Design a protein around this ligand. Structure first.
Ligand SMILES: COc1cccc(-c2cc(C(=O)O)ccc2Nc2nc(N[C@H]3CCN(c4cccnn4)C3)c3ccccc3n2)c1
Ligand SMILES: COc1cccc(-c2cc(C(=O)O)ccc2Nc2nc(N[C@H]3CCN(c4cccnn4)C3)c3ccccc3n2)c1
Ligand SMILES: [Cl-]
Ligand SMILES: [Mg+2]
Lengths: 143, 139
């Protein structure tokens, strides 16, 4: 089976955050299955405990975790803490345009290898995801 | 015990009196590892952390590992608070989250859903009763 990618963004993302999440998930599918694609596409049905166990099972199964961290979210932050504890390969994408500052706990978790945080402008997100996987692919290129 | 108070930078800036009240009541029960962060200079809107991001990340991580209990104010959405609760669950810490539903917020399913009702508890409260609730938990 293809690689498993985990995409993580704020469930309270606004209209603009939502179009960016759809762009990121759509591009990630070129690299494998996006486990959270239906959640990104949508009492929460199934209830909070079920949701927590499902995202934990998907985080643990992931080959890579890609989080959009522009909007503050306890959920995105919690999933990044569980992902670092699972020693996963993590990429955070943050848009500095709003002038809001990314939490020091996320910027400060970066080690430039396994945990990376990249500032980006909305227009270049597809090109930056291609760059990230071209530098360290999940599947080897054909000859 | 060594107690870890976890709250957000936005929460600390807007709800300073509440954060001071929670930290003050926790001192009755033990040492509060984040006592010099919670109601200290938290900078202003748009400002980067004065102390350096990696320094901050490593210091909070060191205090989290040493803590006997993590008490988090989860009313304000924060990637930092969420991240610290994720690291603390992976460290098998006893965790109490305090949420204020009068704010109008809906607490993330990932925090409400992490509750196991004993080791990780989430309590909805109104600001006026926080001292009585911390007394209840520690007694
Ligand atoms: C936008 O792209 C994503 C992608 C991955 C994770 C998340 C996510 C974010 C948050 C967060 O930001 O706090 C919380 C839970 C998340 N995960 C999730 N959320 C499911 N349902 C949602 C319907 C509304 N909702 C709410 C509403 C208010 C409060 N908390 N949760 C949760 C869900 C259903 C079935 C199976 C697995 C699920 N997993 C978001
Ligand atoms: C309010 O009560 C608390 C209690 C415990 C943790 C936290 C906290 C929250 C967040 C978060 O919500 O994202 C991030 C880091 C935190 N921890 C921390 N923050 C220090 N300084 C602050 C000055 C403003 N600041 C900023 C400003 C913009 C962006 N990110 N961080 C970080 C700090 C200094 C020295 C030693 C240890 C430190 N540790 C807050
Ligand atoms: Cl600081
Ligand atoms: Mg595989």
């Amino acid at each position: 089976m293809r690689p498993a990618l985990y995409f993580c963004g704020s469930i309270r993302g606004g209209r603009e955050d939502r179009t960016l999440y759809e762009r990121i998930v759509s591009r990630l599918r070129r690299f494998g299955t996006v486990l959270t694609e239906h959640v990104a596409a949508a009492e929460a049905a199934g209830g909070d405990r079920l949701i927590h166990e499902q995202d934990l099972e998907w985080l643990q199964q992931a080959d890579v975790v890609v989080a959009e961290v522009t909007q503050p979210s306890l959920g995105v932050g919690y999933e990044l803490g569980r992902a670092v504890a699972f020693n996963k390969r993590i990429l955070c994408l943050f848009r500095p345009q709003s002038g809001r500052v990314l939490s020091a706990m996320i910027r400060g978790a970066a080690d430039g290898s396994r945990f990376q945080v990249w500032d980006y402008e909305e227009g270049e997100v597809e090109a930056l995801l291609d760059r990230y996987f071209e530098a360290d692919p999940l599947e080897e290129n054909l000859y």
